[PDB]
Design a protein around this ligand. Structure first.
Ligand SMILES: [Zn+2]
Length: 476
């Protein structure tokens, strides 16, 4: 079969990295009237990615013709799948022509195809590297229109190009986008923001007088912690690296940060999504049986990730650490409720429970309506997540909650819910175990009603390392 033959020959062409032969085989299929499939086109897009940008001649046929092949696949109305977007982007990156990368995205739109975030990258970053803000903002507007949401790298690039071209309005807007979408910024972005606030353009932007009611109504309207009405005040900024104390008080300026509310409607949307995602991955009857059990149990003040409590910082499962965490949670519960312990059934039956009194205790918790043993093959993460969300209560786990399945939960609501609900344990020699409670303020970029800014750096473990903030306050 000829379609099937071209495949074999393109799969073979190549592990070898032979672009000139893939381009020959491409042309031959069209001379033979063999219609290229999704698969053929993808391999061909990949193979062309391997070509390099001619630093000393007119561009090479591999990259150059790669864009041609891309264009033709779309004309042919061959549907793109995830590999198509990836390879198309590699091709764009390798070529490093932002205008040609932008063309590929325009072509996709013209044929009713939704570009991916990675499709926009080579265009956005290309224009930003070249200092072409006007084109960078075109790409940004295109992405907004296609409903593709930027991540921190795209925002930071937009921030820097706005700084480079002295555009104080676009800096403001991008900082608001960082607040809304990212919350806590990387070391790179943090340093960039610090430069912005100490810069001549920042010193020279602002207003001496403004409508206080306008700001007040914007604060209420935006949900808290910002106003979005523009730079306030005048003159040089005092810009310091600082920390918040445990109550959210800036150690530099003594402003107390805001605790920003989560809208209960968002929480109910998230709970529905969580249940849908869990039932796609669990045996549906197993998850449903837990949902039904939970409906008949509680109330709960806390839910414990039993496997994480037994294992975090241990060389093997510590019933001590789990049990001490149960006791601690019950002690801080105003009415002394036992926490809901989520644990695999395997664990309920043999170390923990190697020792008869530990096994009896596990059964006692179950009998108290405070332990659910998840069935073999289940991922218990869905279970403790769903319980904490549904019971609207604390979640005790030191799981990072960022990798694998946790990426499925998104990067707006879930991180905000996490900060309000997650309790983590720490241990010291002098004191033993401690529960680290949610902060009484929101760890996010905040803009105060008088235009003062507080910007938090993102950190891997804010109990291990002390989180740095930027305090930017007008000097007069
Ligand atoms: Zn401050």
């Amino acid at each position: 079969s000829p379609e099937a033959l071209l495949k074999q020959k393109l799969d073979m062409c190549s592990k070898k990295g032979d672009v000139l032969e893939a381009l020959r085989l491409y042309d031959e299929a069209r001379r033979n009237g063999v219609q290229l499939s999704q698969y053929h086109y993808n391999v061909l897009l990949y193979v062309c990615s391997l070509a390099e940008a001619a630093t000393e001649s007119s561009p090479n046929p591999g990259l150059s013709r790669g864009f041609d092949i891309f264009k033709q696949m779309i004309v042919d109305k061959v549907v793109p799948n995830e590999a198509t977007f990836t390879n198309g982007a590699r091709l764009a990156v390798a070529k490093d022509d932002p205008e040609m990368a932008f063309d590929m995205v325009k072509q996709m739109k013209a044929f009713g195809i939704q570009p991916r975030l990675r499709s926009y990258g080579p265009a956005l970053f290309g224009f930003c590297r070249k200092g072409d803000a006007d084109k960078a903002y075109e790409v940004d507007a295109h992405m907004v229109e296609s409903e593709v949401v930027p991540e921190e790298p795209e925002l930071a690039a937009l921030l820097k190009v706005s700084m480079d071209t002295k555009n104080a309005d676009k800096v403001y807007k991008t900082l608001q986008r960082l607040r809304d979408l990212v919350r806590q910024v990387s070391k790179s972005t943090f340093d960039m923001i610090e430069e912005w606030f100490k810069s001549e353009v920042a010193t020279k932007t602002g207003v001496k007088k403004w409508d206080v009611k306008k700001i007040r109504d914007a604060v209420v309207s935006g949900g808290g912690g910002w106003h979005g009405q523009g730079w306030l005040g005048t003159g040089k900024w005092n810009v310091k690296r600082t920390e918040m104390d445990e109550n959210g008080v800036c150690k530099c300026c003594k402003e107390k940060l805001v605790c920003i509310d989560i809208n209960p409607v968002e929480t109910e949307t998230f709970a529905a999504s969580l249940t849908r995602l869990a039932c796609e991955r669990e045996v549906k009857a197993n998850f449903n049986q837990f949902q039904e059990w939970l409906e008949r149990h509680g109330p709960f003040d806390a839910v414990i990730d039993g496997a994480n409590m037994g294992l975090v910082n241990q060389r093997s499962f510590s019933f001590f650490q789990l049990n001490n965490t149960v006791q601690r949670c019950q002690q801080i519960s105003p009415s002394k409720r036992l926490p809901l312990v989520i644990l695999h059934k395997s664990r309920v039956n043999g170390g923990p429970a190697t020792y008869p009194k530990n096994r009896a205790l596990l059964e006692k918790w179950k009998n108290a309506g405070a332990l659910y043993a998840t069935p073999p093959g289940s991922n218990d993460d869905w279970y403790w997540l769903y319980a904490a969300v549904s019971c609207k209560c604390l979640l005790v786990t030191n799981d990072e909650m960022r990798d694998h399945l946790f990426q499925l939960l998104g990067n707006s609501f879930f991180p905000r819910w996490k900060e309000k609900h997650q309790v983590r344990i720490s241990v010291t020699r002098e004191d033993g175990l401690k529960l680290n409670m949610p902060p009484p303020y929101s760890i996010v970029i905040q803009e105060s009603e008088d235009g003062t800014w507080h910007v938090p750096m993102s950190v891997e473990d804010d109990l291990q390392t002390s989180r740095q903030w930027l305090c930017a306050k007008r000097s007069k």
